[PDB]
Write a protein that binds this DNA or RNA. Sequence first.
RNA 1: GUGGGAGAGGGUGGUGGAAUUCCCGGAGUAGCGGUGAAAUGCGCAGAUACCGGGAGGAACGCCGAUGGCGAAGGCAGCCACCUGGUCCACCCGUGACGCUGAGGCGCGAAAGCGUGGGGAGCAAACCGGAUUAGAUACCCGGGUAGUCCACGCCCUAAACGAUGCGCGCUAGGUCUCUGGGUCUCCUGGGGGCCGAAGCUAACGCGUUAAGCGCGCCGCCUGGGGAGUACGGCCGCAAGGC
Lengths: 116, 87, 101, 70
Amino acid sequence: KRQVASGRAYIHASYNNTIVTITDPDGNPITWSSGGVIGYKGSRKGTPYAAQLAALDAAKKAMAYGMQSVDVIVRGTGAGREQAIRALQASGLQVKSIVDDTPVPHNGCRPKKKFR
Amino acid sequence: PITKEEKQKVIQEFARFPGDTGSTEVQVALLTLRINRLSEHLKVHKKDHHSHRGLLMMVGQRRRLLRYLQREDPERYRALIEKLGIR
Amino acid sequence: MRRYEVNIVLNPNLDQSQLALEKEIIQRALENYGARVEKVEELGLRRLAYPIAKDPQGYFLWYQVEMPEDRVNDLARELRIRDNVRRVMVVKSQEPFLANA
Amino acid sequence: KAKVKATLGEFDLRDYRNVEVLKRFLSETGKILPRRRTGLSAKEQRILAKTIKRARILGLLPFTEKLVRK
RNA sequence: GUGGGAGAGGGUGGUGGAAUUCCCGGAGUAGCGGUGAAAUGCGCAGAUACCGGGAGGAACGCCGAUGGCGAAGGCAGCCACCUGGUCCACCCGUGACGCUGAGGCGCGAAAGCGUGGGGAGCAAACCGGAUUAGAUACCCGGGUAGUCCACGCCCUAAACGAUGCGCGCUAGGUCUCUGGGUCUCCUGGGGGCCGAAGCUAACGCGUUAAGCGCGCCGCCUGGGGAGUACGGCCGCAAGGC
Ligand SMILES: [Mg+2]
Ligand SMILES: [Mg+2]
Ligand SMILES: [Mg+2]
Ligand SMILES: [Mg+2]
Ligand SMILES: [Mg+2]
Ligand SMILES: [Mg+2]
Ligand SMILES: [Mg+2]
Ligand SMILES: [Mg+2]
Ligand SMILES: [Mg+2]
Ligand SMILES: [Mg+2]
Ligand SMILES: [Mg+2]
Ligand SMILES: [Mg+2]
Ligand SMILES: [Mg+2]
Ligand SMILES: [Mg+2]
Ligand SMILES: [Mg+2]
Ligand SMILES: [Mg+2]
Ligand SMILES: [Mg+2]
Ligand SMILES: [Mg+2]
Ligand SMILES: [Mg+2]
Ligand SMILES: [Mg+2]
Ligand SMILES: [Mg+2]
Ligand SMILES: [Mg+2]
Ligand SMILES: [Mg+2]
Ligand SMILES: [Mg+2]
Ligand SMILES: [Mg+2]
Ligand SMILES: [Mg+2]
Ligand SMILES: [Mg+2]
Ligand SMILES: [Mg+2]
Ligand SMILES: [Mg+2]
Ligand SMILES: [Mg+2]
Ligand SMILES: [Mg+2]
Ligand SMILES: [Mg+2]
Ligand SMILES: [Mg+2]
Ligand SMILES: [Mg+2]
Ligand SMILES: [Mg+2]
Ligand SMILES: [Mg+2]
Ligand SMILES: [Mg+2]
Ligand SMILES: [Mg+2]
Ligand SMILES: [Mg+2]
Ligand SMILES: [Mg+2]
């Protein structure tokens, strides 16, 4: 019960799971999805296909609010990161732009043993 | 730091004759100026070791020159010591 | 005394009287620490590359000075007190190293 | 594609207040270009770096930006 | 001496942005996380993802290098102050003032100790989850000392070039950092790689010697026993010589 029709689509990808969040122009979210949202549970959430289905689900849930214009924002590196964008373009939603915002530090914090 | 006029004042003061730059008198003088400066710097900044080495080396050079002067001309050595007020 | 450059970035939204007050305090501060003012460039409103104190833009001033060294840092400390002063950077003035010349 | 210094006038490497010239030494991201692209001297490169960073602190230049397309 | 130069050399203060974590608020559902696969774990008191605001600590992405500096340990945001070493040019000054250096004294990564702070992230010990024949291990979730600062101790190491310091001599080629020069190049001083002569058991070293010489210090004398025992000295202890 909103009728937004334009906004940003954030794709957060990792080697574990890929999630998607649709949002209004000033950044407040509308609907979202993920590999767990759909049937998949375990490591299966990391497959590109899961990313696809997730993008799709969030896309439909966006159609419900009458979303049309969508600006894609990508964060993280993971399998199906690109696949997510692929499905999102073919979602029927018109994608204005795509940007990679993936957060990187300036080397502030020491990471876990497996990250060094 | 030590600027040009600061240096020259001392050089003029300690030169055996005009134009003299590198005589033992002047050397020990300048050296001792740098010493005093560094020591006042190491009153504070006690944590600075890398400079303290420099201080050691300087001291050593000075003692070398002085030992030389005292070896050759004990009078001028006495004069230098009296003037600078060291050792 | 040595030769420096004082960069000051203040709030863009100041009106005449306010800005004049701030520049007044600045001038007074410079004089107080014994800084002779050689030349000055006021660029005013410019668009920052990243927001500073939530403001997208900034007001820029530049002062080429000659002042006693030991009083520099304090002179910086005094300038940042002003809320309306967002940025202060003092830099020893240097010769213009060129390139592609 | 040639280098940055290759196309440019006579410009001060020490000027942190000059955006128009400095910007050209940065990529799409706010990152500082390597020597391969800037085509400077190691000396030139260092001075450029320092200067850039100075500009950054003054908010004249970006600390980082966001990559388009992809 | 004068005049120039490069530098993460050192100390003090200030300051900047990214990120992690936590708190506040908005908006927003059903999972997130994690792994070879999983589970512990967190989530309906509303998490994860998204926007905005705040708090705090720690480390400085690109620049960055096969790079630079330092006697070694080691030193990377930016600014200022304080300060050490060093290189070049001029050929101006003193006139052998030199080299080495038992003992001494000072420095000395990390971990560790004392007192006081500080604490985000990481994380010995420890508490749990799965694996598996088993687990105290490898993987996963938490997590204290500690990692951080002040001051005082500790004196070790693959503290490595496994190569003491200084000087003179003995083909070059090429890459490079930094000066000067009348700037295809030449001349200094650093950092690498090939290679004359020569050396070397060989590998390899080769104007940055492991070559030819000289001076001085340290050290070795089969393996184990053993860096142990005893003694001494240092140390709050650990323990060190
Ligand atoms: Mg998963
Ligand atoms: Mg430094
Ligand atoms: Mg420092
Ligand atoms: Mg919230
Ligand atoms: Mg569950
Ligand atoms: Mg539950
Ligand atoms: Mg519960
Ligand atoms: Mg936030
Ligand atoms: Mg707190
Ligand atoms: Mg690098
Ligand atoms: Mg190196
Ligand atoms: Mg080392
Ligand atoms: Mg210096
Ligand atoms: Mg002569
Ligand atoms: Mg003579
Ligand atoms: Mg010696
Ligand atoms: Mg130590
Ligand atoms: Mg320690
Ligand atoms: Mg302690
Ligand atoms: Mg663990
Ligand atoms: Mg088990
Ligand atoms: Mg276990
Ligand atoms: Mg953990
Ligand atoms: Mg020998
Ligand atoms: Mg060579
Ligand atoms: Mg040249
Ligand atoms: Mg050269
Ligand atoms: Mg031999
Ligand atoms: Mg042979
Ligand atoms: Mg060879
Ligand atoms: Mg030799
Ligand atoms: Mg040999
Ligand atoms: Mg025996
Ligand atoms: Mg034996
Ligand atoms: Mg032992
Ligand atoms: Mg005995
Ligand atoms: Mg004993
Ligand atoms: Mg005792
Ligand atoms: Mg032991
Ligand atoms: Mg020893």
